[PDB]
């Protein structure tokens, strides 16, 4: 019993974290095989960030300008290239701790673990979701750039996020490991803002199923609804639309608890319209949307890596 | 910016997790140097659990009755001894991945990361706190016994908890790494129950300072309180008494934000009286008590967003 915001074990990723220094800028790099991946803004000074021409800034650098440190060992950079907003530093040594891995681009609503790092040293691990507005509500200070997000499936680490920046509202923005930003953000010190966010409906429903599996059932009711009526209500409270794909994905949880997805949608409609009336669900007075249906099944079944 | 329930990176502990089997029972063990630590109830059957005589059960075992698996490698048990509620299995191989470590017994209110494991394989990592009633609100299924709690301040792993059981309310009980239980619990399936739990006041105050550091002050007020009047109010909402030690510990956070400890206590008194009125604090509609003053200093910026 119990239900916690659980991250994947971070060991396979910790063995890939390195410190990348270029001039006065120090940040984190991800060392996989013979390449170190890091944000391309490592080559910028504070003035450069105002309007950087990364190709022009990069052509002025030699391999020896990039200092890469793995633990207390200096790696030697033997090549460099840029792919979108990520800099790839070819090193002479393949990382002996390289796990089985893939680079995956995730969709909003999907969750992942973040291994927050400073100076190439892991500091903490936490779970978060890619918001519908493509930001992440992370916990990052200056120097955390290059920290990564990942998921694990079997023995394979799927890297999905690399940290680049903090927006004015305190939320965060970054790229996939191919350097493509999530959201309409750019790596330049210019006016940028997170758009209005919405709640991840399928994830709230998954968490309601998790509450039922854990004995919290006060919100259940005799009612059901239709997908169309539910979507009208959900749109009113800034909730993401629920699709037939989402209902299909919630099938296993619906079968285990005996509560149909539209039966749970009727519970969610009532909670949106009336609140919790002083009650809590899994220790929360807010409807939690950072657990996916897969996260709920995984935590409630004890899947290991 | 941001404030998350953050766990320590688990890699140093993952490299120590092993599977321990004794007969039909399989659980997790912690392999440090040439010793594997695990709950002594690994030698029990389901029937043995009501009134087990561990000394009598253990004397009937030989080293080769304990099967220890580290990855796909069988370790050889060359000795065994019981220390309180932990079994220590001496093995013929020192763990090459043994980090710098210490065993520490923690006090209620202290937080730690839990690396939940099944069959010697890590499943997830989350942050926990030792409740004032000595239980932990973990996430553990059957087979999670032997999973450990730890902190990793400055590259040294301080092991503070080993999981033993789940109480009827769905909360968890365990021991320190010397096998001493936290709380009035025993490793017997006799009628046991968690005592009435209370809120960790010093931690709620730490989290209110975290909210001020991150730029939010909506909950503050122009009032102060004496320590005694605060405690008289706090106890009415099932909050733990705040001691002078707690006031001293909050000193650094008070100095960084410019808000006196007893002034933050007056804000807490008002929050308890009024609720949040549709507002949130650091993304929460409840007063959070699983962040210590030390956790807030570690995670938050050293510069307040004034
Ligand atoms: C030195 N230099 C290379 C540098 C300096 C500052 C930054 N910026 C500004 C910025 C603004 C538009 C776009 C981008 Cl990509 C970057 C960041 O946002 C980094 C950052 C990341 N996470 C948490 C943070 C908390 C406080 C301050 C900064 C944080 N990036 C590079
Ligand atoms: C056979 N075997 C060794 C065994 C069997 C059962 C158990 N007990 C019962 C028990 C009750 C009083 C005290 C203790 Cl120490 C043990 C447990 O509580 C194990 C346990 C731990 N965590 C989460 C759980 C979730 C569901 C079911 C069990 C869980 N322990 C050992
Ligand atoms: Cl302590």
Curated annotation (Swiss-Prot), chain A:
Q: Where in the cell is it found?
A: Host cytoplasm; Host Golgi apparatus; Host nucleus
- The active site is formed by 41 (for 3cl-pro activity), 145 (nucleophile)
Result of changing residue 189 to A? Does not affect ability to cleave and inactivate human TRMT1
Could you tell me at which residue positions the Glycyl lysine isopeptide (Lys-Gly) (interchain with G-Cter in ubiquitin) crosslink is annotated in this chain?
A: 5, 90
Question: Per the record, what is the consequence of mutating residue 90 to R?
Answer: In strain: Beta/B.1.351
The record lists the effect of residue 145 to A as:
Complete loss of 3C-like proteinase nsp5 cleavage
**Residue span, Peptidase C30 domain:** 1-305
- List the Cytoplasmic topological domains: 1-305
Activity regulation statement:
Inhibited by pyridone-containing alpha-ketoamides compounds 13a and 13b. In turn, alpha-ketoamide 13b (tert-butyl (1-((S)-1-(((S)-4-(benzylamino)-3,4-dioxo-1-((S)-2-oxopyrrolidin-3-yl)butan-2-yl)amino)-3-cyclopropyl-1-oxopropan-2-yl)-2-oxo-1,2-dihydropyridin-3-yl)carbamate) inhibits SARS-CoV-2 replication in human lung cells. Inhibited ex vivo by michael acceptor inhibitor N3. Inhibited ex vivo by compound 11a and 11b.
Superkingdom of origin: Viruses
Q: Which reaction does it catalyse?
A: TSAVLQ-|-SGFRK-NH2 and SGVTFQ-|-GKFKK the two peptides corresponding to the two self-cleavage sites of the SARS 3C-like proteinase are the two most reactive peptide substrates. The enzyme exhibits a strong preference for substrates containing Gln at P1 position and Leu at P2 position
What does the record note on quaternary structure?
Answer: 3CL-PRO exists as monomer and homodimer. Only the homodimer shows catalytic activity. Interacts with host FBXO22; this interaction promotes the proteasomal degradation of nsp5.
Give the function comment from the record. Cleaves the C-terminus of replicase polyprotein at 11 sites. Recognizes substrates containing the core sequence [ILMVF]-Q-|-[SGACN]. Cleaves and inactivates human TRMT1, preventing tRNA guanine(26)-dimethylation of tRNAs. May cleave human NLRP1 in lung epithelial cells, thereby activating the NLRP1 inflammasome pathway. May cleave human GSDMD, triggering alternative GSDME-mediated epithelial cell death upon activation of the NLRP1 inflammasome, which may enhance the release interleukins 1B, 6, 16 and 18. Also able to bind an ADP-ribose-1''-phosphate (ADRP).
The name on file for this protein is 3C-like proteinase nsp5
Annotated source species: Severe acute respiratory syndrome coronavirus 2 (2019-nCoV)
